[PDB]
DNA sequence: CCCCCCCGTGCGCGCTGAGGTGCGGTGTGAAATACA
DNA sequence: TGTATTTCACACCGCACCTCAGCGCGTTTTTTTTTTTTTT
């Protein structure tokens, strides 16, 4: 009475971004009430295969869509998705509480985002409980990056989380982490392609994405990292950002970063002046 | 005036590798009207070729444009489907003015609407990235590469 | 007819050189606007299997196309793929900055590329921060060769990349790396066949492709590496390099390499045999 | 007022059932041959 | 003029051909696993 048509089902799945298989199966079996194709799916004799194929097709679409967005467009697409209301005033006042002019952090972001070699790593240095991890992890969370973990450097499998994401955080890099950077990732901070390795697989040769590293060691004062002086821009977080009297006055929700970017699209030297017809074509990928 | 000459036909062939006669049919009377026209223009400036695309779009249901120049010279080609039927006299006056060229620089005849090689000409042209396009393909070309 | 035809899809995917599945699926769904086979594919309820087959066939075609080219054809293709603005002056100036003639480097490069045994490893020895890795990384980027890493030598699969690429780079070889080359991998520096694994595969025995190493250690001065003095050609880098405002006073492009190889197609003595078909229709019989 | 190039080919093994078309196993006589 | 003796002639009824595509359709150990050498 009503033949099944996998195309409209994958179009519906991509409509709601239901990537995982179980959510597909459950939501579509629910939607069978008012979607003839879904009743055809319910009466179909090979349901699990269709769910699996739909999951695979949606994953292909979404992953390829993410990989094809140029950096200003991706920043626009991460600005759209951040939810909340706040202000950049939190960033400005946090910095001015650390006695660091914002213009310094701008003139570092301008380079760090462009991937310019030898200026493609921003280190935040200060005694702990001073607000380093707050800003660094809030900013990495905004950029949709992946938080790395210096602990597993016994294995060479801890760089595998850089095959996809476009921003990495290395948290509390102690002397061992600094030595590891100086010895094996001399290339990465120089922007040129590196050779990462994953578990039970083969190595891939990709460009090293930008980075944010938090450390208690002033590398630009040490001497064994004489090479590291030319590819790390240090930031002195000295003052106590956390509770002055019991409650942390400062926190950066996604709205703060979003409004920061929207108001500072010019000074970062990017472009989001598309405004093509109404918003965008965005027709279909059935 | 100025339909065409052995020299204009020769240059067209050297650039597009086929005769202008194999993609058109003949209208001997300059007053006979028709919606579809094939136009060849010699010695045309790039800025006017590009401007004509935007201007013709507003009075056409379909338009396909391309150009090819070499040692000999430059010569573009247009398949135009006007919303309203026009005579060669009218199209001649419209395009000489629009393109900033003498009438002698043009060649105009309606399309050959029956013949596979003729339809393939437009079909193959639509596969080049450089070709400018507007509207839905004419049925005689579409049905010229279908038929199961 | 609207029936989907897989050969057309394979021809199209090979046409733009899309190999990975995700790009094939996304780009093809995008192309579905003006491709009857595409608008047929969208409706074929076995989309995933077709995508997997298309990616596998494109991978097969491309891999068996690269391995079928002798070396001068490979360098010709890499030169065809390189674009930019530059010259060989932007290289010979660097060499004169380090105070080495270029003619000696050419007399070495010819042999190195030919893979001649006992002369198939260039070692660039220089103190830290003198520009070694800059030149080596530029050159290996142009030759489209992979770069190894002595980090994983505890896990013996770090040689897996040696099974495909035609110019291996090992940067910053320590004492342990040189001892490893002296003891285990002497055959590769000679040029005799070696066995190499590939994750979930079998040890494919192949001739060892040419290498390129940078190490602070002077192998031709030590006495433990007496048995490497006859398998390594060295070039000394002494004069200083990048310490100035994040801009190394010398950066080697791909246009530099292109004009280098093209301008010296006679001195490196690269050529092909009796030729009567070079600039013709590429054999695209994969449809 | 007539010829200086578009053009690189065919499909899940296997079924299997309604569909109808025809020269015949069999449908089996009024016409038709010759008898007396 | 009555009557034995027979294929063509429209066809009961068909044996059996070819004609489509909706039904079936798939691999996963080995390495990595932290285990105790592997200089010290």
Curated annotation (Swiss-Prot), chain C:
Compartments, record wording: Host nucleus
Residues bound to ATP: 126-133
PTM section of the record: Phosphorylated.
Cross-link (Glycyl lysine isopeptide (Lys-Gly) (interchain with G-Cter in SUMO)): 207
UniProt-reported outcome of changing residue 207 to R: Complete loss of sumoylation
Domain named SF3 helicase: residues: 100-250
Assembly information from the UniProt record: Can form hexamers. Interacts with E2 protein; this interaction increases E1 DNA binding specificity. Interacts with host DNA polymerase subunit POLA2. Interacts with host single stranded DNA-binding protein RPA1. Interacts with host TOP1; this interaction stimulates the enzymatic activity of TOP1.
Family indicated by similarity: Belongs to the papillomaviridae E1 protein family.
Known function: ATP-dependent DNA 3'-5' helicase required for initiation of viral DNA replication. It forms a complex with the viral E2 protein. The E1-E2 complex binds to the replication origin which contains binding sites for both proteins. During the initial step, a dimer of E1 interacts with a dimer of protein E2 leading to a complex that binds the viral origin of replication with high specificity. Then, a second dimer of E1 displaces the E2 dimer in an ATP-dependent manner to form the E1 tetramer.
Protein's recorded name: Replication protein E1
Lineage: Viruses, Monodnaviria, Shotokuvirae, Cossaviricota, Papovaviricetes
Parent-protein start and end of this portion: 308 to 594 of 605
């Amino acid at each position: 009475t009503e033949k099944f048509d996998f195309g409209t089902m994958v179009q519906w799945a991509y409509d709601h971004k239901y990537a995982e298989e179980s959510k597909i199966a459950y939501e579509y079996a629910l939607a069978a009430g008012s979607d003839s194709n879904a009743r055809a799916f319910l009466a179909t004799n090979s349901q699990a295969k269709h769910v699996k194929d739909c999951a695979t097709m949606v994953r292909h679409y979404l992953r390829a869509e993410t990989q094809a967005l140029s950096m200003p467009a991706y920043i626009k697409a991460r600005c759209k998705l951040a939810t909340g209301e706040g202000s950049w005033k939190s960033i400005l006042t946090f910095f001015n509480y650390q006695n660091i002019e914002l213009i310094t952090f701008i003139n570092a972001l301008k380079l760090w985002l462009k991937g310019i070699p030898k200026k493609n790593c921003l280190a935040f240095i200060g005694p702990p409980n001073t607000g380093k991890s707050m800003l660094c992890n809030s900013l990495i969370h905004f950029l949709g990056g992946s938080v790395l973990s210096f602990a597993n450097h016994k294995s060479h499998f801890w760089l595998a989380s850089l095959a996809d994401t476009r921003a990495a955080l290395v948290d509390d890099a102690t002397h061992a982490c600094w030595r590891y950077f100086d010895t094996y990732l001399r290339n990465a901070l120089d922007g040129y392609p590196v050779s990462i390795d994953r578990k039970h697989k083969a190595a891939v040769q990709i460009k090293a994405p930008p980075l944010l590293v938090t450390s208690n060691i002033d590398v630009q004062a040490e001497d064994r990292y004489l090479y590291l002086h030319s590819r790390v821009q240090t930031f002195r977080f000295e003052q106590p950002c956390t509770d002055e009297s019991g409650e942390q006055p400062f926190n950066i929700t996604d709205a703060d970063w979003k409004s920061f970017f929207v108001r500072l699209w010019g000074r970062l030297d990017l472009i989001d002046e598309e405004e093509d017809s109404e918003e965008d074509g965005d027709s279909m990928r059935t | 005036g100025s339909r065409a000459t052995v020299f204009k036909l020769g240059l067209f062939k050297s650039l597009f590798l086929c005769s202008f006669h194999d993609i058109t049919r003949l209208f001997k009377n300059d007053k006979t009207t028709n919606q579809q026209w094939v136009l060849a223009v010699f010695g045309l400036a790039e800025v006017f070729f590009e401007a004509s695309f935007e201007l013709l779009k507003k009075q056409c249901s379909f338009l396909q444009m391309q150009k090819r120049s070499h040692e000999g010279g430059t010569c573009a080609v247009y398949l135009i489907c006007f919303n309203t039927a026009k005579s060669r006299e009218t199209v001649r006056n419209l395009m000489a003015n629009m393109l900033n060229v003498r009438e002698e620089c043009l060649m105009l005849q309606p399309p050959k609407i029956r013949g596979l090689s003729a339809a393939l000409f437009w079909f193959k042209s639509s596969l080049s990235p450089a070709t400018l396009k507007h509207g839905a393909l004419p049925e005689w070309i579409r049905a010229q590469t279908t038929l199961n």
